[PDB]
Design a protein around this ligand. Structure first.
Ligand SMILES: *[C@@H]1O[C@H](CO[C@@H]2O[C@@H](C)[C@@H](O)[C@@H](O)[C@@H]2O)[C@@H](O)[C@H](O)[C@H]1NC(C)=O
Ligand SMILES: *[C@@H]1O[C@H](CO)[C@@H](O)[C@H](O)[C@H]1NC(C)=O
Ligand SMILES: *[C@@H]1O[C@H](CO)[C@@H](O)[C@H](O)[C@H]1NC(C)=O
Ligand SMILES: *[C@@H]1O[C@H](CO)[C@@H](O)[C@H](O)[C@H]1NC(C)=O
Ligand SMILES: *[C@@H]1O[C@H](CO)[C@@H](O)[C@H](O)[C@H]1NC(C)=O
Ligand SMILES: *[C@@H]1O[C@H](CO)[C@@H](O)[C@H](O)[C@H]1NC(C)=O
Ligand SMILES: *[C@@H]1O[C@H](CO)[C@@H](O)[C@H](O)[C@H]1NC(C)=O
Ligand SMILES: *[C@@H]1O[C@H](CO)[C@@H](O)[C@H](O)[C@H]1NC(C)=O
Ligand SMILES: *[C@@H]1O[C@H](CO)[C@@H](O)[C@H](O)[C@H]1NC(C)=O
Ligand SMILES: *[C@@H]1O[C@H](CO)[C@@H](O)[C@H](O)[C@H]1NC(C)=O
Lengths: 408, 215, 214
């Protein structure tokens, strides 16, 4: 019953740090819509000694304008209190992430056998206000067996404390740490490693290149690789050197480790271990998780102006970048900016072979040869009005246009 | 480039403490892990442990945990391994290495390795004799005779003579002592002009000898 | 040595693909993505070929690849070359900052050419004769089938007492080396006209002779 399905591969880097994370970036979150909701259901497919076991979670209705972190409302085949192991979080710009605590089994299995269970894939079901059913299939490229417990308490003994608190927004950590080294930028080899500890989770991040080697005046950007399931946005770091006495050499170190889950808990600890070679230094700081809604959940848009005369106006919807002619399914939807009734405002939907639905008022749509979609509006008044048009194809990228119609 | 060099005693008496150090050059301890690996002669590898996070992480092989101590001396670019209550089961080549990547899983740089022999038998330093030999190339050599603790190293012309050198694995005599030979093949014309000297090192007995090998 | 499980040996012909397995548990190999593979040539330290299951360090050819399925990790070498003859070890993380190694697998490359030994015989040195001893040194190198027989003779007649011979050892060029020593008193050396070291290999013999005469 999926109109459009998207495939993705989940890669595990190094080890499971205590939570599983998967990103779904292609579901539509329409702009200028307070009343736009989505029905989301998620199935996790587990392999248990070669036998397959499904786990269905119900996440109710997403309300992006009022809520950004969702706990499943009901589970089928789950172990008791399992619903507690899952979170659904909106990340902004039309994306969301699904998280599972991975140190407790979410399915009851025999103690004697089935002790090692592996996650095989995750299926995500998404139905928008137009009634279109979106599906995402994410397959575990390199899975490991889920190992319950294995959570020793870890603390580092000699690390200078910092009153700086690192805040996490939409799973992303952002902190800047002033520091001092005896080495000038020219004669410095800089390296840094981090560790984040809290609750049941232990994340390690390193520079895969080892060290910056020669440090340059100004900004020195570099990648960092963290243990766990990797986000499509890479984690990063920047070492900034001041411009050229007996005083030391000042630097600012900014770190942005990307997949950081609030399952760590408020007041978990970020450890930063760095070294400047011409020794060793360790800084520790607390980490807190913002509860603020991103308020930018809308998917990216393309805004364009159309000037008309009279009370009729036309607009041509181009093919999607990845879409080609003869694409098996093409869907185009449209609604006026800031609707207020879900029962009537979202009736204009066209497939390749459907025509204009009876419930669509003062808008006509038809596919021309070369697959350009032509929209006609016949009731435009004198005041400007904004039209939101969304087009998708089977293996292509969903694209949304904001079209402003203005009288000449 | 990072280079590592182990250094130990050669021979350790049973039930005494084995003490080894690794010297680092061309690099720093920095944020990496630093590990020790050992290999008994003719057997497989065994992980001993590693030290990381600026000495905050000391992680040892659980089967050797209570006999092992790792330490680092950054001011000398050295880190060390101590093994207590030693037996012949601890006779092995010991390697030091840099462990990088997440959890230090990647042992990317290794030292050449040092052999440590656990024995209550008295050490014995060797006697060194020259092996003097128309032919286009000629063979000269050194005989390293009657030494008990195994590791013996031979270089030629202070190590500048590398090509054509073959040092043979030692023979174990019925007495329990070893002998080996090292030979170098040189063009016969070079023999008249260039003198060839073999450098013999037997660390267990603190033996360093140079022998001229003249026709 | 508590270890992971590898086959004791595998073999292949040049140009073929050879696969080495390494079997662990859900607590080491199937529980993490920290599997490494090491190549060890005789007398040298191990060298990493693969880390983190399938990642290759800079400088190692893409003829070496690693994979994992369940609790079993595999190293595959395609385009096999005589240079690939070595011992191969797997290793894996085992939790709580500990590592386990496999038992090791000896790889043999088949079809390598037969090589006759090179034999050098040394007489006793003048210094040792002054210590009233005389040992003859027979050095044998560069024979590929790693088996050899050494027999000593004095004035053409077989000699048994005082002979000590090593087992063959693999060289860097995949050939083998060995040595034999005949330990005599200086009096025995000067009371004979000649001594000989005869080396037998694959049905062929190579003989070398020394004489106390100048
Ligand atoms: C989602 O499924 C609902 C019924 O089951 C609920 O969701 C599944 C995934 C389990 O968590 C189960 O325990 C829940 O009770 C349907 O009522 C709902 O319409 C479904 N939504 C869609 C269309 O995906
Ligand atoms: C087109 O959409 C329908 C659902 O309306 C889906 O079943 C079908 O697979 C889609 N076509 C292709 C080729 O994906
Ligand atoms: C045991 O497993 C089944 C799987 O279908 C699940 O439905 C049931 O609720 C589980 N019981 C408990 C107590 O976990
Ligand atoms: C689940 O939570 C309830 C809260 O009342 C508790 O009584 C119950 O023991 C918990 N069970 C599990 C499986 O954690
Ligand atoms: C991050 O990785 C990319 C691709 O490997 C590389 O080009 C870049 O230099 C790295 N660091 C920065 C500065 O983004
Ligand atoms: C703390 O700061 C001082 C500043 O001189 C530095 O020497 C020391 O190494 C630092 N220690 C840690 C644990 O960062
Ligand atoms: C920490 O404070 C509370 C308790 O969890 C929470 O609402 C908040 O979002 C956390 N982090 C912050 C200060 O944003
Ligand atoms: C934006 O829409 C206009 C009008 O259809 C089109 O010409 C243009 O190519 C679009 N640009 C992008 C980046 O989508
Ligand atoms: C939405 O608001 C409009 C005026 O902005 C109103 O006329 C209409 O009744 C509302 N929608 C419905 C169908 O309730
Ligand atoms: C496709 O057809 C539309 C409708 O006639 C037209 O506006 C557009 O220019 C055409 N584009 C191409 C590339 O044929």
């Amino acid at each position: 019953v999926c109109q459009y399905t998207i495939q993705s591969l989940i890669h595990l880097t190094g080890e499971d740090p205590g939570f599983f994370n998967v990103e779904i970036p292609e579901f539509p979150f329409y702009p200028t819509c307070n009343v736009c909701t989505a029905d989301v259901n998620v199935t996790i497919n587990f392999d248990v000694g070669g036998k397959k076991h499904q786990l269905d979670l119900d996440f109710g209705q997403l309300t992006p304008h009022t809520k950004a972190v969702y706990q499943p409302r009901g589970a089928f085949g789950g172990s008791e209190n399992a619903t507690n192991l899952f979170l659904l979080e909106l990340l902004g710009a039309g994306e969301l992430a699904l998280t599972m605590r991975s140190k407790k089994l979410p399915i009851n299995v025999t103690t004697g056998e089935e002790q090692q269970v592996s996650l095989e894939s995750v299926d995500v079901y998404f139905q928008d206000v137009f009634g279109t059913m979106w599906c995402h299939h994410a397959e575990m490229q390199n899975p490991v067996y889920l190992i319950p417990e294995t959570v020793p308490y870890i603390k580092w003994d000699n690390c200078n404390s910092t009153n700086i608190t690192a805040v996490v927004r939409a799973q992303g950590l952002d902190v800047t740490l002033p520091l001092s080294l005896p080495t000038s930028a020219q004669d410095s080899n800089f390296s840094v490693k981090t560790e984040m500890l809290g609750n049941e989770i232990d994340i390690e991040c390193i520079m895969e290149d080892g060290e910056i080697s020669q440090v340059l005046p100004g900004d020195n950007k570099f990648n960092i690789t963290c243990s766990g399931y990797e986000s499509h946005v890479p984690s990063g770091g920047i070492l900034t050197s001041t411009s050229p006495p007996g005083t030391g050499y000042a630097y600012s170190l900014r770190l942005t480790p990307r997949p950081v889950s609030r399952f760590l808990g408020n007041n978990s600890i970020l450890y930063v271990f760095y070294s400047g070679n011409g020794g060793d230094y360790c800084i520790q700081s607390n980490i807190v998780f913002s509860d603020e809604i991103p308020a930018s959940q809308d998917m990216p848009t393309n805004t364009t102006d159309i000037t008309y005369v009279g009370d009729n106006a036309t607009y041509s919807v181009p093919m999607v970048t990845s879409e080609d002619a003869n694409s098996p399914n093409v869907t185009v939807t449209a609604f006026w900016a800031w609707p207020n009734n879900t029962e009537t405002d979202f009736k204009c939907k066209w497939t390749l072979t459907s025509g204009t639905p009876s419930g669509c008022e003062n808008i006509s749509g038809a596919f021309a040869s070369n697959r350009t979609f032509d929209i006609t509006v016949s009731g435009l008044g004198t005041a400007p009005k904004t039209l939101i048009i969304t087009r998708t194809a089977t293996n292509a990228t969903t694209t949304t246009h904001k079209v402003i119609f203005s009288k000449a | 480039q990072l280079q590592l060099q182990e250094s130990g005693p050669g021979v350790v008496k049973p039930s005494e403490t084995l003490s080894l150090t690794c010297t680092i050059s061309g690099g720093s301890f920095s944020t990496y892990y630093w590990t020790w690996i050992r290999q008994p002669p003719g057997k497989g590898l065994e992980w001993v442990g590693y030290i990381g996070n600026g000495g905050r992480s000391l992680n040892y092989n659980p089967s050797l945990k209570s006999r092992i101590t790792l330490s680092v001396d950054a001011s000398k670019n050295q880190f060390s391994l101590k093994v207590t209550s030693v037996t012949a089961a601890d006779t092995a080549v010991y390697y030091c290495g840099r462990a990088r990547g997440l959890r230090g899983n990647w042992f990317d740089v290794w030292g050449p390795g040092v052999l440590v022999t656990v024995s209550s038998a008295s050490t014995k330093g060797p006697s060194v004799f020259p092996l003097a030999p128309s032919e286009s190339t000629a063979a000269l050599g050194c005989l390293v005779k009657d030494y008990f603790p195994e590791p013996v190293t031979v270089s030629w012309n202070s190590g500048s003579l590398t090509s054509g050198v073959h040092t043979f694995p030692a023979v174990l005599q019925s007495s329990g002592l070893y002998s080996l030979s090292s030979v170098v093949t040189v063009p016969s014309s070079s023999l008249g002009t260039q003198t060839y000297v073999c450098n013999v090192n037997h660390k267990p007995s603190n033996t360093k000898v140079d022998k001229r090998v003249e026709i | 040595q508590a270890a992971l499980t590898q086959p004791p040996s595998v073999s292949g012909s040049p140009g073929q693909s050879v696969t080495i397995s390494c079997t662990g548990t859900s607590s080491d190999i199937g529980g993490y993505n920290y599997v490494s593979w090491y190549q060890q040539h005789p007398g040298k330290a191990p060298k990493v070929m693969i880390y983190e299951v399938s990642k290759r360090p800079s400088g190692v050819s893409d003829r070496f690849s690693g994979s994992k399925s369940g609790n079993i990790a595999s190293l595959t070498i395609s385009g096999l070359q005589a240079e690939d003859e070595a011992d191969y070890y797997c290793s894996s993380y085992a939790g709580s900052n500990t590592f386990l190694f496999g038992g090791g697998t000896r790889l043999t490359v088949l079809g390598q050419p037969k090589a006759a030994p090179s034999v050098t015989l040394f007489p006793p040195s003048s210094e040792e004769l002054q210590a009233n001893k005389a040992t003859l040194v027979c050095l044998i190198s560069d024979f590929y089938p790693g088996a050899v027989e050494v027999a000593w003779k004095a004035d053409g007649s077989a000699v048994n007492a005082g002979v000590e011979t090593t087992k063959p050892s693999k060289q860097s060029n995949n050939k083998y080396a060995a040595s034999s020593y005949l330990s005599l008193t200086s009096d025995q050396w000067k009371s004979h006209k000649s001594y000989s070291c005869q080396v037998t290999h694959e049905g062929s013999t190579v003989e070398k002779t020394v004489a106390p005469a100048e």
